[PDB]
């Protein structure tokens, strides 16, 4: 009918090229045709369906968000499918990989998966990586690093497979109904928008339309029911108290006081505070000196935990940014509190980001298994050169926070945590202001307004070296680790450049 | 310090491409080096320095959202900055022109804008057009049209200039603080994933975080504060009341009684009503049959109306989906009622979606200027065949639903709606279901399903012959209009493809 009118379209006015006649309705949407396809098209009744359709081939990247933490099934899971159906030379770019990952060896050993990009690495995972399981060296991201990776074309992700509790039909997902309740699925909205193909792995239905819908129907494009995508009962379970270890107290009673007589303790501060440790502790210090002097904190970020809803319930934060729940404290107040808002990896961490709310921060507390002479932290490696933590988003919001502070003791047990020079080197000293530790206190001398902050309020000070050879006098010299030559691991450093490599242990 | 290490990793291992060593903080985040401007580098003290910033050229692309309706003052205010900076061969791109953009005409004739790409044209505007003002054709998009071009690659978008009412300085802007409360930002959700670069014009900021962030702050590149975006007043008025005129209130009961015995109205039917006439009041007559049977709707969709809004805190509708408010009662119910819910257009409408709603209408009121034997629906050309119209998410929610349903009078004083051959096919007659008029009600023979319902419930039908004959016979054969050879737009279906040229009028 049209055909000659666009001919002629083409050949006497400036057009748009390309262009060609219509054709009917269903022509480029052949699910219109039918009714019940319109709606259903997206339902898969296995697991292995969902793969077939999801047109998953050998050297593909596959993905997975860690919000079900230790109790995640989903990595297992589908692992397990793709090794029975015979998946050769796979990229699996979890955002972190934790110790119920072990199966993982097998699978690498099969030749089923040839490269690892993650932020965490644990277990005996890591264990087995450390001896020299792959050929291929691990690529070490932070949270944020994983998102510019992505951007950048480098990690190409061809199916992600996210796990959620609750669904409708369309796709539209959260984490505040179903079994697994985990709360913020911030990581996963970054898959939800980059991958190629996104597969959810729901454990139950919901009617259309799903709201909040974390990730939205626009988003995805299979989804398959499943039993459990995490440990239903673990991740609902309410906050664990804070620690009644008296040296941590003692760290985190300090590191108030750092904050208090830092320069950043105003009204309208935000702040990150930790999910352990001393670095969680903190909160209940500064919440008297909030109530003492006359002033609210504007925001919390990041994993939020219980603690940090309660001082968001009695008006002391206004408001809480949460990019993963980290209890069901937490993850029924993102459900229920509206200024609990749920934020992406993107929003949170990314370096190329236009907007990540890390750069607006005044305060993070970061833990450390080792800091050196430099201020600069590991977080990947144990003190046997054995990978075992996660680079996570620790250089992240120490990059863009105003004032970083390290909580961690002088000692543990027989190994020092302050030494000359750390094993790996995941976020660099020029990122790190303040160490506080059980022996005392030290800031970065590139700091020079901290120094004098804090001396002027009458802060005890040391220097790091100070702090270094007292933690030397407590354990002895270490005797260093035997490495060979082989890299096991790239540290990225969160623009994608390289900061670091971990070495295979003898 | 470490081009040695990643030189051996090259050479040695199986790396990704192009490894670059660290080289420190903020190498590649300048910004970091000041704690002032990492939260403040994307605010602009005047419209001319986010033109400069946006890196905008002559023949690039900009776009505009139209959520402000006849209010619209953005368009113009932009509009008036780039031509008196001396901007040649732009692209415009603003989803839907009204007929306050006449201001567009001189800019045409200066050359500012050489491409238009746009769903309405009205007003002086859509005459000059149809008089021959501009060389190249307008291109006519659907509402969904539009993001499967911009997803295709057709049109890209350099700069987008959205008004906003509120937004803090990180970019997380919402319709429902500042003064002109618009509500439903869905058609600029489009622009700010899409475009090369996001520029927001605030007229209010709020303190960080802004919740919702129907524009979040990872898609704003740059914020200048303006007077107004919309007209306040007019913008946050509650709903007009429905229809006084009886031919109207004839036709909304007659296709409430075709709704009724369709076969769609069973609890949990899902739908879309219109914006005024009997499309609107339709809905009135929907509720008591409603309650009569114990049904329920399980959604409601589109530019959601007050009296949408009503029926849902009725807990008659159980969520409304909105890509656009339309009064400041459908505004203030987004902010307040949690289900109902602020979509964008690729959840809207968009063919090429992963999930677009309306392709879940069980039923759509629709309305036409005229509509022929063939069922084809013309909304973009007048009876004069000068552009005065809109395609908008006609073709689109009709292409999806289930059942759509033309509501028009016969006749309009001397002109019939009912005709031979529509000027103008925007909408084709494959998706076009009813059409229900004040001389009664004709199925397309295509739809038998229905022919069979509405006849078994003793619903009495015309043909649209019957109808088209007796309209000629109220209204005279009329007079063929002087078109000229010239085309003057090119009217795109929802999928790309040309549906139908709108030529030059005499």
Do not use: M, T, W
């Given at each position: 009918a049209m055909k000659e009118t666009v001919t002629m379209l083409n050949q006497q006015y400036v057009v748009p090229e390309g262009l060609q006649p219509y054709q009917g309705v269903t022509a480029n949407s052949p699910w219109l045709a039918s009714e019940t396809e319109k709606r259903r098209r997206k339902i898969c009744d296995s697991l292995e369906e969902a793969i077939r359709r999801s047109g998953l081939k050998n050297g593909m990247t596959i993905s997975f968000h860690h919000a079900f933490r230790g109790g995640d099934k989903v990595v297992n899971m589908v692992m397990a499918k793709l090794a029975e159906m015979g998946f050769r030379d796979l990229t699996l770019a979890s955002s972190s990989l934790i110790d119920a990952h072990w199966p993982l060896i097998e699978h690498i050993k099969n030749g089923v998966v040839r490269q690892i990009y993650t932020s965490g690495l644990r277990g005996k995972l890591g264990e087995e990586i450390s001896a020299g399981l792959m050929e291929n060296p691990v690529q070490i991201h932070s949270h944020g690093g994983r998102v510019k990776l992505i951007q950048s074309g480098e990690l190409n992700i061809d199916v992600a497979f996210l796990g959620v509790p609750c669904c409708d039909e369309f796709g539209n997902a959260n984490g505040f109904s179903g079994k697994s309740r985990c709360g913020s699925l911030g990581y996963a909205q970054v898959d939800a928008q980059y991958a190629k193909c996104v597969v959810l792995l729901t454990e139950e239905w919901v009617e259309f339309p799903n709201y909040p819908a974390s990730i939205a129907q626009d988003q995805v494009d299979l989804i398959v029911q499943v039993d459990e995508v995490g440990d239903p009962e673990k991740i609902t379970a309410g906050a664990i108290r804070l620690s009644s270890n008296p040296r941590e107290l003692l760290i985190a009673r300090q590191a108030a006081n750092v904050i208090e007589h830092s320069?950043?303790?105003?009204?309208?501060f935000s702040l990150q505070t930790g999910t352990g440790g001393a670095s969680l502790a903190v909160t209940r210090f500064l919440e008297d000196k909030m109530r003492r002097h006359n002033i609210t904190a504007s925001f919390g970020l990041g994993g939020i935990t219980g603690t940090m809803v309660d001082l968001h319930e009695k008006g002391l934060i206004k408001a809480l940014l949460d990019t993963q729940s980290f209890d069901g404290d937490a993850a029924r107040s993102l459900a229920?509190?509206?200024?609990?808002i749920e934020i992406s990896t993107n929003q949170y961490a990314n370096p190329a980001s236009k907007g990540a709310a890390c750069e607006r921060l005044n305060v993070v507390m970061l833990s450390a298994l080792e800091i050196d002479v430099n201020f600069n932290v590991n977080v990947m490696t144990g003190s046997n050169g054995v990978l075992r933590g996660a680079s996570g988003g620790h250089s992240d919001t120490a990059a863009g926070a105003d004032l970083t502070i390290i909580t961690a003791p002088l000692v543990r047990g027989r190994i020092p945590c302050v030494v000359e020079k750390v094993l790996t080197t995941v976020t660099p000293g020029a990122s790190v202001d303040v160490l506080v530790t059980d022996h005392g206190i030290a800031v970065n001398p590139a700091r020079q307004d901290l120094l004098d902050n804090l001396r002027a309020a009458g802060v005890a000070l040391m220097t790091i070296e100070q702090l270094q050879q007292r933690a030397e006098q407590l354990t002895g010299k270490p005797q260093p680790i035997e490495f060979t030559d082989?890299?096991?691991?790239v540290v990225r450093?969160?623009?994608?450049?390289?900061?670091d490599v971990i070495r295979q242990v003898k």
């Open positions: 320069g950043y303790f105003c009204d309208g229920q509190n509206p200024h609990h082989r890299v096991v691991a450093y969160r623009d994608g450049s390289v900061i």
